[PDB]
Write a protein that binds this ligand. Structure first.
Ligand SMILES: [Zn+2]
Lengths: 35, 71, 106, 70, 70
RNA sequence: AGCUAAAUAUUGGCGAGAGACCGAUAGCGAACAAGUAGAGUGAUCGAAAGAUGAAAAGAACUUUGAAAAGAGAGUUAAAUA
RNA sequence: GCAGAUCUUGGUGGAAGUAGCAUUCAAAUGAGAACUUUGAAGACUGAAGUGGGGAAAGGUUCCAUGUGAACAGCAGUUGGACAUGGGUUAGUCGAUCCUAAGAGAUAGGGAAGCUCCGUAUGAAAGGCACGAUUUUUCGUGCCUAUCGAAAGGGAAUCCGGUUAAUAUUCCGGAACCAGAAGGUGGAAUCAACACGGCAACGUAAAUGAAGUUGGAGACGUCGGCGGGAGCCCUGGGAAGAGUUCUCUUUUCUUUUUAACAAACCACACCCUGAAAUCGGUUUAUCCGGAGCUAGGGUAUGGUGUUUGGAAGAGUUCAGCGAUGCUGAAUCCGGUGCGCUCUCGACGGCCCUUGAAAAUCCAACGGAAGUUGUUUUCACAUCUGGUCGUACUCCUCCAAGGUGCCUCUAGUUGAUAGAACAAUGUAGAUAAGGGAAGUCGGCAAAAUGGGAAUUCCCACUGUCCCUAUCUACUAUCUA
RNA sequence: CAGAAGAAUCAUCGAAUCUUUGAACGCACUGCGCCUUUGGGUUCUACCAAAGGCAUGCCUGUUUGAGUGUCAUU
């Protein structure tokens, strides 16, 4: 909805930003994983 | 929606109408737990989070919880 | 043209009261008008009093004293007839008591 | 940038607990400029944004150049 | 907005330190609308006599900022 | 009315050392993002998934193709890595 | 030590490329165009939209740019996909405050116990003033939780412009509300807290403690009448675009004034009055010695008039030269059981005689009080936090004409192409007969009818006896 | 990778920091209060900010009370 608590805005933003491509240089430092 | 986010355990198991969490029993002082729920216990017991303070205590024990500064 | 409500308070109710106006830009607009004021009513009889503007409760503070009361005993609380009825009844009761006390003392 | 060069307003990323009064004090004490208006919003990512409108006595471009983000 | 018909009063309001600017409007009916901007109200004076408008114009204190047709 | 060390218990806690044990469908559900992804309104449920090479030296360059790729070429002991 | 356990897990077959899943032209872009974009044509929803908004709900899904891996019962230059960035601005709009039915902690009491009952209950259930300071150790007097409504109650904002995406929020202009202090000016008093009018009551002001009340908030439903606004209808005026051999003063389209601030503009009551020979009067007979008609007043102003705001804005035409500049017009009507919304005055039905609180006001009461005192009068000065706001969709807005048609607006998508045999479905027409069909007038046509399930009359592809047409299906192709 | 030059993504670890919550504690669950002190400002009886406080039961002591509870006071 619209009348959303501010914690929800942080909660929604973090959940969405988890779906983000893992950087190329990240792989170059041995190993980094998903999920 | 019949459940919302629980303030204590952060799971979407807080029943709005009963005003009680189905997971941890919030707002009861004690956490909901059951011996028939062995897998449920291991999902939320000590070690599933940070244990930031317990790691400090375990590290401090060897020296006898000493205080002060080195010479 | 079909016009939408300015607010987002769906399910228009008693509070949602609007007026259609034409703007200098040639647009039909909803203008929400607050409910009309209520004139004070007499305590004894209940008819609205005479000489008091019919405005809102919060608004009444802005008015001066003379604009909220009438220059008479119980002015702004009782009607003129109610005041007249109150005065004559009080005097007749007092006289009925004075003669009753006179009869008992003799 | 459009707001800065048009309406003499600077746009800041501010603290989450900052209110219009504290943003005014912080801007006044960090850039020696007097705001005449502050309007804020919360971005969908959980960050607060403040539109600080400056006095006509000051130029928002000058402050922006001084800050260095111009 | 307040419509003032008393010219002297318009002078006194102009002499008041609250008044900031005044505007002169030339209407098609040859009326001059003296719109004086104050804190709360915009005081307008419509004068039908043309020479009255000019004799009004420099009787305005020089410190006040008069403006041409808006 | 009351206290009391030791010999005793200990699937947890902080550590340690072992094994005629299992060897990736086994051994813990989980050797790896494992109570993770995912499912359910909820209590709960719950996986699959280890191996280039000594070294990334992970294929410059040319060509074809819109591109993905292909072909010559190159690296390597080996690209039947 | 496996061939099997409708074995377990993984892998892979035949079935099988099988079952299957209203647009046309030119142009642009592209490696590529049945599906993208633009223009033309043809159509579809037809104000009850495929329209435009919100609630709940989703959470970035809005916008721009790029890509065409996975999605796409097809594909794409494409998706609500992927990647990269951007986007939600409020003193006045909501929440925030109040209460509702109820819930609920506390007091207490149960219960082995997780806990249960209980909500002013046998609770010490919390205040206010007074005073030369009272044996410098305080006396006297008075009165006596919380949660639960983004639809109920409630202080206050409008217009124009602006974005790729946000607006009652931003920009320009114009207001308003609430609180806060002093100041300036005005008003009242050693006749202590203003005068006037028969009156209703009026006004720039015109102190009011304790204590005691009253009002607003604040209250069902239905019908008719009246008022206003917007919309619809329409006469001219103007502007442009038509149509026009001729006819056609003609055809089509447009013609705006916000919040707010000023002065003025009509139902209750008062005064004179005493009434039936009954008067006044509704669309609907209602009231009148509990004082009619009539005359003069008082208040309530629903509204209307004139402005201000305000033409400087907006729109439409002409031009002239960053998008500027210059012209004009933006007018006068008439209206109606019209529709939408609101207000006033009645009349019923009620019976179920029709929430609460916050909040604001007034009254009675009379404490106190030349220098002062008061002033709810006018003006200036200052401030207004926190959160929501993008986008998607139970409920809102809803044109005209005669179930259809059209304007505004929105689509042209749903995998396509080619053929049209047999089949199936659907819809029709059919010579002569007319229920002979079948257990039977089932379905059609008749209009179905008449008389007691039957009979009579009418009717028809039910039947003799089938035949023809159409679309779809079916078929093949990508 | 860039960049830096008692280094360190080092070890140990006795000093600290330690957001919002949670037994979770001013009251509620976007918020709403009260008390104390201090400070700011281009504006100072206003507004704002900061810091430190305000849960419940029980114990020991302290202070202030109440009682037609038990008494004493020539
Ligand atoms: Zn919980």
């Amino acid at each position: 909805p619209s009348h959303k608590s501010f914690r929800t805005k942080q909660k929604l933003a973090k959940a969405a930003r988890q779906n983000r491509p893992i950087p190329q240089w990240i792989r170059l430092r041995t190993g980094n994983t998903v999920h | 929606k019949s459940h919302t986010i629980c303030r204590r355990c952060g799971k979407r198991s807080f029943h709005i109408q009963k005003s009680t969490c189905a997971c941890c029993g919030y707002p009861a002082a004690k956490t909901r737990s059951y011996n028939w729920g062995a897998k449920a216990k291991r999902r939320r017991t000590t070690g599933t989070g940070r244990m930031s303070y317990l790691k400090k205590v375990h590290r401090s024990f060897k020296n006898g919880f000493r205080s002060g500064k080195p010479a | 043209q079909r016009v939408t409500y300015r607010r987002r308070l769906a399910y228009n109710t008693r509070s949602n009261r609007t007026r259609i106006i034409k703007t200098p830009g040639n647009n039909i607009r909803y203008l929400h008008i607050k409910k009309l004021g209520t004139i004070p009513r007499c305590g004894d009889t209940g008819v609205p009093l005479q000489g008091i503007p019919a405005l809102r409760p919060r608004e009444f503070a802005r008015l001066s004293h003379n604009k909220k009361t009438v220059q008479r005993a119980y002015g702004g609380c009782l009607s003129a007839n109610a005041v007249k009825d109150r005065i004559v009844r009080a005097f007749l009761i007092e006289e009925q008591k004075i003669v009753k006390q006179k009869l008992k003392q003799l | 940038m459009k707001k800065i060069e048009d309406d003499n307003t600077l746009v800041f990323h501010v603290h989450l607990k900052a209110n219009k009064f504290t943003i005014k004090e912080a801007v006044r004490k960090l850039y020696s400029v007097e705001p005449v208006k502050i309007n804020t919003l919360i971005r969908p990512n959980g960050t607060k944004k403040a539109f600080v409108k400056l006095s006509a006595d000051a130029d928002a471009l000058d402050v922006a150049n001084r800050i260095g983000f111009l | 907005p307040r419509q003032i018909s008393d010219i002297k009063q318009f002078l006194e309001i102009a002499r008041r330190k609250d008044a900031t600017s005044a505007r002169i409007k030339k209407n098609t009916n040859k009326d001059v609308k003296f719109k004086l901007r104050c804190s709360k109200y915009l005081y307008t004076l419509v004068v039908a006599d043309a020479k009255k408008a000019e004799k009004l114009r420099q009787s305005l204190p020089p410190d006040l900022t008069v403006t041409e047709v808006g």
